[PDB]
Amino acid sequence: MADEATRRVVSEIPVLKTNAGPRDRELWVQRLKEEYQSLIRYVENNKNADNDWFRLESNKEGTRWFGKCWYIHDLLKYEFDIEFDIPITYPTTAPEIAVPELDGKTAKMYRGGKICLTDHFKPLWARNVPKFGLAHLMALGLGPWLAVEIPDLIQKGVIQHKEKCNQLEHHHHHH
């Protein structure tokens, strides 16, 4: 019905046709470049809209991804440092993204380090398998979740980002 804009953007993130795990390094290296291009495409696409998202990189084997993502809201930017690895279950099944920034700063946490994905994401993932990729996982999972739980973190005052400049330039206040 609605949420068409979201699907538009996701459609601009091509599906991976190799779709392999870290076991077959040959196909893995193929999916790796497919996935990287998908990441770059999304970031570029975002930068064109003047709303930059994230930078995420991996090690030489691509077995562990680490980086940081920043979210613009109102007039403020909220960057979070994140890390996770790529189990053999991936990309057939989604892994757990570790966000040590949010963990502890909210009572609604799955487990120490593990984020709380929506119940609707689980069947959504299974229905589309395979043809997935980190770019898809991040946008379809982390992206919407930020608009769900981050308000709690912000309002509760545990995020040290109540202002960006404070009196120097201007308050986060566009009118």
UniProtKB/Swiss-Prot annotation:
CDD domains per the UniProt record, alphabetical: UBCc_UFC1
GO cellular component entries: extracellular exosome
Gene Ontology biological-process entries: brain development; protein K69-linked ufmylation; protein ufmylation; regulation of type II interferon production; response to endoplasmic reticulum stress; reticulophagy
InterPro entries, per database record: UBQ-conjugating_enzyme/RWD, Ufc1
Glycyl lysine isopeptide (Lys-Gly) (interchain with G-Cter in UFM1) cross-link, renumbered residues: 122
Pfam families named among the record's database cross-references: UFC1 (PF08694)
Keyword terms of this UniProt record: Disease variant, Isopeptide bond, Ubl conjugation, Ubl conjugation pathway
Post-translational modification as stated in the protein's UniProt record: Ufmylated at Lys-122. Deufmylated by UFSP1.
Outcome following mutation: residue 106 to I: In NEDSG; decreased ability to form thioester bond with UFM1; decreased protein ufmylation
Consequence of substituting residue 23 to Q: In NEDSG; decreased ability to form thioester bond with UFM1; decreased protein ufmylation
GO function term, MF aspect, one: UFM1 conjugating enzyme activity
Subunit structure: Interacts with UBA5 (via C-terminus). Interacts with UFL1. Interacts with UFM1. Interacts with KIRREL3.
Domain notes: In absence of UBA5, the active site is solvated by water molecules thereby reducing its nucleophilic activity. A linker region of UBA5 is required to reduce the amount of water molecules in the vicinity of the active site and elevate its nucleophilic activity.
UniProt disease link: Neurodevelopmental disorder with spasticity and poor growth: An autosomal recessive disorder apparent soon after birth or in early infancy. NEDSG is characterized by axial hypotonia, delayed psychomotor development, poor feeding, failure to thrive, peripheral spasticity with hyperreflexia, poor overall growth, and microcephaly in most patients. Additional variable features include contractures, facial dysmorphisms, and ocular movement abnormalities.
Job of this protein: E2-like enzyme which specifically catalyzes the second step in ufmylation. Accepts the ubiquitin-like modifier UFM1 from the E1 enzyme UBA5 and forms an intermediate with UFM1 via a thioester linkage. Ufmylation is involved in various processes, such as ribosome recycling, response to DNA damage, interferon response or reticulophagy (also called ER-phagy).
Protein name: Ubiquitin-fold modifier-conjugating enzyme 1
Gene: UFC1
